[PDB]
Design a protein around this ligand. Sequence first.
Ligand SMILES: [K+]
Ligand SMILES: [K+]
Ligand SMILES: [K+]
Lengths: 250, 250, 250, 250, 250, 250
Amino acid sequence: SDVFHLGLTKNDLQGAQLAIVPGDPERVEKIAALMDKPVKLASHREFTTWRAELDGKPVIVCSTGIGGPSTSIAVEELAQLGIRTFLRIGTTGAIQPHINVGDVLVTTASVRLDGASLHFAPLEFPAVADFECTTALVEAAKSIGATTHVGVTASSDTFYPGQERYDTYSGRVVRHFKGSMEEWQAMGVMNYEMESATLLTMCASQGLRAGMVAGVIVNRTQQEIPNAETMKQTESHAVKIVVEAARRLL
Amino acid sequence: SDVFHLGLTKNDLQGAQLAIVPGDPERVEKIAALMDKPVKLASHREFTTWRAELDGKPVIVCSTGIGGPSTSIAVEELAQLGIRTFLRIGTTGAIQPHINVGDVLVTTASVRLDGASLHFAPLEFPAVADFECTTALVEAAKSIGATTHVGVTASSDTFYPGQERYDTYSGRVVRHFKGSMEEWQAMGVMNYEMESATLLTMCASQGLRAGMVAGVIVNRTQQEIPNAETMKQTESHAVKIVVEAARRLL
Amino acid sequence: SDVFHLGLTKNDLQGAQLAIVPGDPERVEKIAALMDKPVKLASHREFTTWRAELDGKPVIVCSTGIGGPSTSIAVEELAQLGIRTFLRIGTTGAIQPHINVGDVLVTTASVRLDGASLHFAPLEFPAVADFECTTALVEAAKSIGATTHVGVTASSDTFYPGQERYDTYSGRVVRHFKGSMEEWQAMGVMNYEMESATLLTMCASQGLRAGMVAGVIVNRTQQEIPNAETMKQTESHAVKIVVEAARRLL
Amino acid sequence: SDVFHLGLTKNDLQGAQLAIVPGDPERVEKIAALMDKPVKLASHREFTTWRAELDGKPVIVCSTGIGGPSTSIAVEELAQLGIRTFLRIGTTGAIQPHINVGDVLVTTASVRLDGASLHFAPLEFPAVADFECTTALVEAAKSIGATTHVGVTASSDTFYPGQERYDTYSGRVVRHFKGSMEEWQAMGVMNYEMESATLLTMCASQGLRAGMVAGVIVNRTQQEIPNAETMKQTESHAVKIVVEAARRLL
Amino acid sequence: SDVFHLGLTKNDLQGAQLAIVPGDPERVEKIAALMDKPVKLASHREFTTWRAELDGKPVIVCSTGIGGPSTSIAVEELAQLGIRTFLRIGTTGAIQPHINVGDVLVTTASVRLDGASLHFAPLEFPAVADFECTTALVEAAKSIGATTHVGVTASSDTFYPGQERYDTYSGRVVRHFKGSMEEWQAMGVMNYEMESATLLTMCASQGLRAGMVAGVIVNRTQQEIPNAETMKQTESHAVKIVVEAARRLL
Amino acid sequence: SDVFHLGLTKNDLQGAQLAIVPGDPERVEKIAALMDKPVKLASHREFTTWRAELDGKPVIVCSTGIGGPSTSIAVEELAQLGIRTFLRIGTTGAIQPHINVGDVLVTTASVRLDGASLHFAPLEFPAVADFECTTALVEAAKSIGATTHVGVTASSDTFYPGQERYDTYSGRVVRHFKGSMEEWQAMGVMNYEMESATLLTMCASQGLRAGMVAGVIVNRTQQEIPNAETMKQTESHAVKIVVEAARRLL
Ligand SMILES: [K+]
Ligand SMILES: [K+]
Ligand SMILES: [K+]
């Protein structure tokens, strides 16, 4: 390997300068299979990587794992192997009443509820997306007729207390986080997830382009349990959007 | 009057929902004059307000004064008077080598080197521009052929120490600010100015739309005294840009 | 001009080493007109300057605008032009029940609810007034029989949320500021305003003398609407006090 | 499954109350295999879970992925599934001259260079190991004659800047982290790793028991490329230690 | 004197490398008198020092006064005179319902509610005890049949507001501290006292060994007034434990 | 006794409402002796209390020990016992070139380098002296012809690292404190001491009056070993000053 974690060589990438970066390794084969000539490159720890081709151009798909720490590894190592553009795709829970299940969120910038962003820029630095990547994502979403919200996302180093989930072992939330979600709701924040503050801050502060889309699968203000077809249909739609954005940035 | 500071009543605005917000009271008339039916409404403190008409629609132009405090009063009072979108326009000094004088900077989000933004949202929240506004400003730049850079601006509560100026009374900078400029330039920041971290935080956190454009009059990494002619011309080009963006946002 | 903002030359000051610094430009002519041979020097942005003479000595009156940012400009530039002593005068809202409308507040030091003070000294540094200027102000107030409180003032980068005003567009206050006024009341804080934390910290940390007086025009614990005569009578009384303090510091 | 991420049900665990928690999914089977009746339970995301049996008692081995976020999800979900004690085992780089490769480090508490710990307790709370766990790990080290150092570990949300690595894409470290390594070495810290400040804070703050052991594979103060053979052997020695401690904690 | 405060020479210590450090000077003679050949060395300010012998080895007893500031003096000066191991003993109030009057607390690490610890290590550094000293203390306690809790202690720079005592002059607690005790209770914290965050952080970050035991004299969750015999009997028992730990560390 | 620490009852004080508060128990009698009817009341821990009589009025003199923690206990307990004004007196080291040994320093406010002040008010609140007290101390200095400097003092929770002393066990200073002394001297600070940020914050935030005077025994910028005679004489001059101020504040 040319890098410490990913198990990849420069030649494995065949010149790729753009990576789609889901958190879940299981989505890597899915996205790559939407593209031409998908081939599996490597799988180690949370990092599963495939290569494919889009409009005759090599593209990478690599999973980040959950959270800023493993994200910052994947971005750092892909950057050493020539990746310059990074497009995160996921599914998410909305926290505003006007967003519906099936809608699409494009993130302009994130609230930094994480640790890793601080290892690249102090807190006053904005966790902002690349304007070209944001534009390509909104254009792609509107091109397939998605209902699309564009705005702020809160990025948390935990799934449970930092998103004020109380159905947990302890059933309590530390003082600093208790009531925080209602603050973020009043401030127009669309959703929570767990990798964009790191992704956006580290890319923006190092001349790398990054952006983020997500399919809404639950609305925590009007919460319904999703069935599989809905999770699949929402996942597919965000995957289609992200590939189409990638076409526009190649 | 209907507000504590600006000396304006609601009917003065005639239904206006967009305001162009320079810092300098002097620039107010310069902007009004591009549009139809310019009328001075009020001059109180740092706040000089004219109204004008663009494609048959009332637009406001209202100066903020320098700094987040006076910006916050102007935004809040204009919001009480029906303004939902706010476009800042300045002239500025670049801090990157590749930016040139007479280039145009559209800001996607700002480093929060201010105090007033904290009065709307904790430090982790990003001082992010509205996507529609930022798009309209990039497309408006392209519509007069400007050379445009899209990226992060550092927003400082001081002109002197916070922007690491040493030709001062004391000729010193406090430890926290000594050497900050090099860190911001490493992280790709384009320029400093003194109102945008306030303006973008308070608007993104309350569902008002905001955006910012500036014209470059000096490049601190290759610093020349600016020509009287260049400054006027770059000012006028930035002025046109922000009016044309207004036009696309009505 | 010899300075970037104020539009002043060294010779304009005729040797003045003391400036009275109200926030409102409209008060500049008023104060200068209490003195001998008042002449208008310049007016640009929030900075209106007049020169006069007191006991045959030149004095400056210059407005700061609202907030620490424009304040720090005015102080910095007047310091480059030879001002060493700075006496802020305003009118204010009391936040304690024992203070009455018409009373006078002299500030010993301020709670730093601002951004600009931090560009001169870290937060643990006290925003303290000059002992000679505080003494001259208390002596002057007692000399005309004022009822005078001497103590702490909270200095905020906003007029609205940082002074927990709720009659606003959003009608809400960010978590950090919600309930803060009742903390400041329990701690004996007399009032809020918006320039002294910057003024005091930047002067105290640079060998410059500064102090602050204010006339009480509303008591927010027993709030009455003032009529014009009361605002005039209160303003006049604080103006008389500040000039008389200036006599004692010349 | 009974939890959002791990894909496990309660009955899967068969009454297990202790979990051994490596970062790397690959190490899971290596640990399981020391014990009786190894059975792979699940592989999802970074979380690979086996069960095994030690002295007739069900034990879990479940990988956390890299970093506090994925560690927090694994700990919370395993706690919902009856796990009350959690032992981490890694391999690591020393940062003290007197530590040698193949030595063993038992951590008493960790420097909190992470974000997820903050989601359980404010920064002042110590990221401290459970005394029973730490004792069992020291005595377990002594029971195979290991050379053991007992002390503080620095726990970083990044592998690269937070551990002051400069052989990177950018080759720079942000100001706050530049020169931190020398300060930690002055203060006697032994090593860096990427999960323990999360793991120990969240467990000490909720009455779960946690502890950590690692084997030293590199000494950054006298840095040698590690031998394939040494690494396997030190890994196996750390693995044995954490199983033997488990044995004393059942 | 060889030191600025303690009034001690190197020869006064006769080679002692271990000090027992109570806060109260009155306890110095008490502890020393449990040992052989106790002699009074000096008394200045809060620093009372006696020397004795244990298993034919010289030992020091020196009082710290209350709080991290005077503690950091006593530790610093005893360190210059050859002390390497420091064993704090006190009596305390429990804040958990399961701890009884007469029980013994051994502190693994402390919540840093103090100022002085920060003059030795930033807040993310754990205020952790020496493993050998913690072990010797637990072994000693169990050796005389004590009921012993081992875990976290909150160390506060005040007796009153930082331990949320309300029977005071003002009867109020600053916002930051109001409700903090119920946070510390939920997090398993055993008790409050006022010197260990400083003691532990400063020793751990400088290669010095430290530990802490306390006898429970009141339980603030089920609060009873103690009589003298109980305070004596509890004090004696902690003194016996600390001397016996000192025997094991000599 | 009526309080937890000081061993005093209310009637002991005979109606006293002012306390003079040295750090050192030894100085207590030295101060008492200037006044009429000196009587030792109590000695417990660092707290030595005498009463005396000045112009027929009971005054208390009570030592605080070193540091904000023990100062906070003394102030709170004396406040429970009717003390409403508190004057500190020390000897100190200057950190400015123009100050001379045997000069007198009256403190207007303090840099908050302590932890206990935070237990009364957040960091932004100023550690400011009471105006009546400070005036009485300046006029009292003038009444014996002392050379007086009026200004800011840095108040440190440590004697060694926080005051940037390097002739220590470790001979090092943590990063945050390394080079702080030069910043304080730039900002005009006069001296360091170890109780005033506590004393002034807790009193200004609860409506008690406080003030501080000190005599200069060493000038760290031109450092000489102090003469036994000079120190006694400067101590006595500071002692007289604080008694004479007491006299003007009764
Ligand atoms: K991970
Ligand atoms: K202004
Ligand atoms: K003390």
